[PDB]
């Protein structure tokens, strides 16, 4: 069967996020770069070959706000993500819909715009068991208490009509678990969110995150449901030399804790992040082979098991 309908409804159960009857369950996947620049890679062929070759459990619709997202077309991106949401529910996929907020970095400044969005969402796709909501991606120069409060602004639009669906809340210092703003995920557990069904985002670039946030993506798994909603195996950048020994440390823990994860990215920009070599998505593939950057391989590989 496909991930679907071998794990059905996921929720949260304890502090990992678990299949219907109560089996922890990894899902592990890829993430889109932003819908405004990389949509044209997101095809029936790609998809095809992410769901079917590459074995994914999951995507994550990653939609900016700024930088020529959402904002310049509300209507236009809303219907390509009910798309984008369905072709990848035919394809056996769980999904992620992806608030890609990043500068500005106070999630309150796209909150207006993330109610009448997610209101749209949730309703049409109410019926499915398959969607999780991302309310806010990189959350950055503001207090985890100024985060709280938008997730509890947030959550009950979603709630009142889909109640059933799990969301992940974003964390401070770029979702570091406060790692790159000098604090930790400590500060989380003491003032948590209140709502249940909830996971809490981590994001790390291997070549330049360490021991100190390995160590902290650890001690956040001991408290609260983690998904690793994007990393990378290069710098902070997206871009540079890999670091696959210290990213196969990370993946060893994340399937001891089995917490779930999304690659950045599956696209073909020029960044070693971006799993597919420039011109491949003009192309129409191959979506393995030759087409694919050394990151891609890596993954890939992981992937497929
Ligand atoms: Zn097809
Ligand atoms: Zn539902």
């Known amino acids: 069967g496909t991930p679907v309908e071998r794990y059905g409804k996921v929720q949260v159960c304890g502090t ?11 899902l592990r996947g890829m993430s889109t770069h932003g819908i405004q620049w990389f949509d044209h890679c997101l095809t029936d062929s790609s998809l095809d070959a992410l769901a079917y070759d590459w074995k994914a459990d999951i995507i994550r619709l990653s939609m900016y706000i700024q930088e020529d997202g959402y904002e310049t077309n509300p209507r236009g991106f809303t219907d390509r993500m009910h798309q984008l949401i369905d072709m990848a529910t035919a394809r056996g996929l769980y999904v992620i819909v ?27 796709h109410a019926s499915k068991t398959n969607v999780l909501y991302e ?4 959350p950055n120069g503001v207090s985890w208490a100024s985060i709280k ?4 602004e947030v959550i009950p639009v979603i709630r009142q009509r889909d109640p059933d669906s799990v969301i ?21 557990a003491a003032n948590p969110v209140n709502a249940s069904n909830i996971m809490y985002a981590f994001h790390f670039y291997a070549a330049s995150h360490r021991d100190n946030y390995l160590n902290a993506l650890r001690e956040a798994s001991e408290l609260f449901p983690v998904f690793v909603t994007q990393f990378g195996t290069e710098t902070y ?29 599956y696209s073909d920009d020029f960044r070693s992040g971006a799993v597919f ?22 993954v890939r590989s992981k992937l497929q098991s």
């Open 16 to 26: 990992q996020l678990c299949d219907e009857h109560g089996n922890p369950v990894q």
């Open 98 to 124: 992806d608030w890609h907020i990043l500068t500005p970095g106070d999630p309150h400044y796209n909150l207006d715009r993330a109610k009448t969005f997610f209101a749209e969402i949730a309703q049409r």
């Open 135 to 138: 309310i806010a991606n990189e």
């Open 149 to 152: 409060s938008y997730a509890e």
């Open 168 to 188: 992940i809340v974003g964390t401070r210092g770029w979702s570091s678990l406060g790692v790159s703003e000098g604090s930790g995920p400590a500060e989380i």
């Open 237 to 265: 950048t997206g871009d540079g030399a890999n670091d696959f020994q210290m990213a196969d440390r990370y993946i060893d823990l994340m399937a001891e804790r089995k917490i779930g994860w999304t690659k950045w990215n």
């Open 277 to 298: 070599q420039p011109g491949t998505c003009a192309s129409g593939g191959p979506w393995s082979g030759s087409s694919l950057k050394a990151s891609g391989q890596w």
